[PDB]
Structure 1
Amino acid sequence: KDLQLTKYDITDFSKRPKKLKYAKGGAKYIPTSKHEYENTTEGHYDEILTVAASPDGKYVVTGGRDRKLIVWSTESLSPVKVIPTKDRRGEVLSLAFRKNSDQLYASCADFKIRTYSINQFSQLEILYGHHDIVEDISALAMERCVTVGARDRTAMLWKIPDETRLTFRGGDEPQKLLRRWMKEPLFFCEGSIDVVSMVDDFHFITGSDNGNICLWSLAKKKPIFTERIAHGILPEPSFNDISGETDEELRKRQLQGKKLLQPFWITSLYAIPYSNVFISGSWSGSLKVWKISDNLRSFELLGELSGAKGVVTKIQVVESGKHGKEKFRILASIAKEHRLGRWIANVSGARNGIYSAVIDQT
């Protein structure tokens, strides 16, 4: 959010990542015209929400609330292109490169998904699908993508050439869950879907704000699986802070019991492609590693990585090893605040940084 893009080398798994160079935008990059197509300044003047690295390796693309996409050469860390979104309302929330391709899919807040070809620096087409802002987009090798909108609570699979979409809706009922438990707890209804990832070309997984991690197939409108309150429930508010009366029993009554408890939001979620391992991160102070079963109907919790403390904004996994023995590095960009807003308050012991976990198979 300090308008800074920093390049790191992460090659040595034993050592810490090493900073090579940085580019910092400032207030000097504010355009003088502000006429929505003169917004072609070389730097970012507003906060940068998302970044993507092109699979060939020559370009890195930054986008944020300044309503532009800046393509930078990796060697000089200098802008080779700036692309305005040409809309007053569209802020680029998420970027996703098609795997082994130059094609970039950007999800904007004006209910759009813009596709660019970066080598030609052109825009192929724009897809119009969501009732609310499109927070996250994920795309595998073939020319299709999955987007999530926040308060429409839908996940959309877009066929890029055919401009068609499959719509997936959750439709969970806490009364129905309570009845099911009574036939057989706290049930929080789902407010917004934030993060999405593609396990393969048939399965994708979405994290919501009520803590739900949902495993979806293309053949089923409903989720196949739902893990509810996956990260946990937020701490109870302080009883001396909530009321302000002298009587501690009145303070405990004003706590109002279990009703004011709210769950953690899945702020980041990454599925290693064509594999059963996926990682979910929230500001609980621990990443979680999950395994999808071989029948692909459910997933279980393998492990918990307690190194990172703070809001987990983005999780990436890289591989460096032989086919017999692979070494995985998990990098999470830990921040004190959510990338969209400053809603989350005073999380304890959070530092801005990069969290790395190096996992070796047996």
Structure 2
Amino acid sequence: GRVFRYFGDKLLISEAKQSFTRVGENNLTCISCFQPRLFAYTVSKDLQLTKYDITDFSKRPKKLKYAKGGAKYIPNTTEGHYDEILTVAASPDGKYVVTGGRDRKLIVWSTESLSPVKVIPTKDRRGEVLSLAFRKNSDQLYASCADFKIRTYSINQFSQLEILYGHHDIVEDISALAMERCVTVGARDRTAMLWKIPDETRLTFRGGDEPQKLLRRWMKEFFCEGSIDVVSMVDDFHFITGSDNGNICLWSLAKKKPIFTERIAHGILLLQPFWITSLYAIPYSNVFISGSWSGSLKVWKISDNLRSFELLGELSGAKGVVTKIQVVESKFRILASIAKEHRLGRWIANVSGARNGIYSAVIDQ
């Protein structure tokens, strides 16, 4: 279960085909893609869940069906959303799509009819759902929540399996592959945590390095980190994080500190760095994609020795706040949800080219 996909150098990024599709909704917060006919699912603060056919890389995402929630659904076990949907994940088997958000509910819908087949409450008055991730090739779902807990589920049992404890702030983002494990990030706790579910153990990785101290040890020959916001797993032994100081860090499970750091990865604009608001490592490959609100999607390549990563290129048609990135293949198709606002309501001054919809990029070789 390690990195074996080396197509980073092959990618024809400079000649990528770019498109954008407007939606009549406000503020996409997440996008989830299904891969065996390929599908995408989008959720919005406007309480809309939408399904797209994305199998034809020649044409933009084709809208198939939608379901909108609303005030009607105030109780929390009703089969509809009544507060901001923050996250969406498509089940690996093609049968289910599950949503969650500020109304402290998981709602699992059938992909067939886009109808709610099960509603599973978190049962906590602070348990907002912030992020979802299925174990790959499984029905095991992991939901990171705002009450500092990660909840696990068996989706074809429609039940809650257990609860994981460790974080000391909201668990903003969570990533999982094929193993029965997951990575989470705790925002202001400035930790990433690796949960080995069957071993009942957990690794803890710490950021939040004092700049004066960093400068002090750099003189042996920058920007304050206040939150680690995003995370993505590249293989069963490595992962990447993104912070609100622009840092993209590569971590190995064996090391306490990051094995590599690219500081202010999306630049600045006395000095303020662009946050990393999106991060997706395509599983077991040497490429990952990063997003902010700086107007482009940065594609990076990891070294074959896994000790560094480097800038492959930029996808510059991606104006707006990138809230989520997914990658599908047949040819790579990058899909990214673009909003005028940050998923969680963090305040963003002047977003250039603010807009609502889905960015698509098709890359060859």
Task: Give the shorter-chain TM-score range.
Answer: 0.7 to 0.9
User: Scaled by the length of structure 1, what TM-score is found?
Assistant: 0.87
Q: In 2, are the aligned partners of 1:127 and 1:163 still within 8 Å (CA)?
A: no
Shift in Å, 1:99? 0.1
Shift in Å, 1:350? 1.5
Shift in Å, 1:227? 0.5
Separation in 2, partners of 1:274, 1:264: 27
Shift in Å, 1:312? 0.4
**Structure 1: 5+ residue stretches without partners:** 32-38, 235-259, 321-326
Shift in Å, 1:122? 1.1
Shift in Å, 1:295? 1.0
Secondary structure of 2:183's aligned partner:
strand
Secondary structure of 2:66's aligned partner:
strand
Q: In 1, are the aligned partners of 2:294 and 2:352 still within 8 Å (CA)?
A: no
If you compute each CA radius of gyration, which structure gives the higher value, 1 or 2? 1
Q: In 1, are the aligned partners of 2:295 and 2:352 still within 8 Å (CA)?
A: no
Secondary structure of 1:199's aligned partner:
strand
Shift in Å, 1:76? 0.6
Q: In 2, are the aligned partners of 1:9 and 1:20 still within 8 Å (CA)?
A: yes
Q: In 1, are the aligned partners of 2:231 and 2:242 still within 8 Å (CA)?
A: yes
Q: Which residue of 2 aligns with 1:140?
A: 177
After superposition, give the CA deviation of every residue in 1:276-323 in whole Å (9 maximum; x if it has no partner): 000000000011000001111001100011011010000000010xxx
Secondary structure of 1:161's aligned partner:
helix
Aligned length: 321
Q: In 1, are the aligned partners of 2:278 and 2:291 still within 8 Å (CA)?
A: yes
Separation in 1, partners of 2:246, 2:267: 7
Separation in 1, partners of 2:350, 2:341: 9
Separation in 1, partners of 2:200, 2:305: 31
Separation in 2, partners of 1:96, 1:163: 19
Shift in Å, 1:174? 1.4
After superposition, give the CA deviation of every residue in 1:109-133 in whole Å (9 maximum; x if it has no partner): 0110110000010111110110000
Q: 1:180 to 1:221 in 2, by over 3 A?
A: closer
Secondary structure of 1:183's aligned partner:
coil
Separation in 2, partners of 1:291, 1:89: 39
Separation in 2, partners of 1:84, 1:277: 36
After superposition, give the CA deviation of every residue in 1:95-115 in whole Å (9 maximum; x if it has no partner): 000000000000010110110
Secondary structure of 2:72's aligned partner:
helix
Shift in Å, 1:27? 0.8
CA RMSD, aligned part only? 1.1
Shift in Å, 1:262? 1.1
Separation in 1, partners of 2:308, 2:125: 43
Separation in 2, partners of 1:352, 1:161: 41
Secondary structure of 2:235's aligned partner:
coil
Separation in 2, partners of 1:232, 1:226: 14
Separation in 2, partners of 1:111, 1:183: 39
Residue 267 (structure 1) aligned with residue 277 (structure 2):
yes
User: Scaled by the length of structure 2, what TM-score is found?
Assistant: 0.86
After superposition, give the CA deviation of every residue in 1:181-215 in whole Å (9 maximum; x if it has no partner): 5555xx11211000000010110000000000000
Separation in 1, partners of 2:237, 2:54: 31
Secondary structure of 2:172's aligned partner:
strand
After superposition, give the CA deviation of every residue in 1:37-77 in whole Å (9 maximum; x if it has no partner): xx101100000000000000010000000000000001110
Secondary structure of 1:180's aligned partner:
helix
Moved more, 119-128 or 48-57: 119-128
**Structure 2: 5+ residue stretches without partners:** 1-44
Q: In 2, are the aligned partners of 1:91 and 1:109 still within 8 Å (CA)?
A: yes
Residue 4 (structure 1) aligned with residue 48 (structure 2):
yes
Q: 1:155 to 1:19 in 2, by over 3 A?
A: same
What is the percent sequence identity of the aligned residues?
100
Shift in Å, 1:349? 1.7
Separation in 2, partners of 1:60, 1:338: 23
The structure that is strand-richer by fraction is: 2
Q: In 2, are the aligned partners of 1:98 and 1:142 still within 8 Å (CA)?
A: yes
Separation in 2, partners of 1:173, 1:67: 35
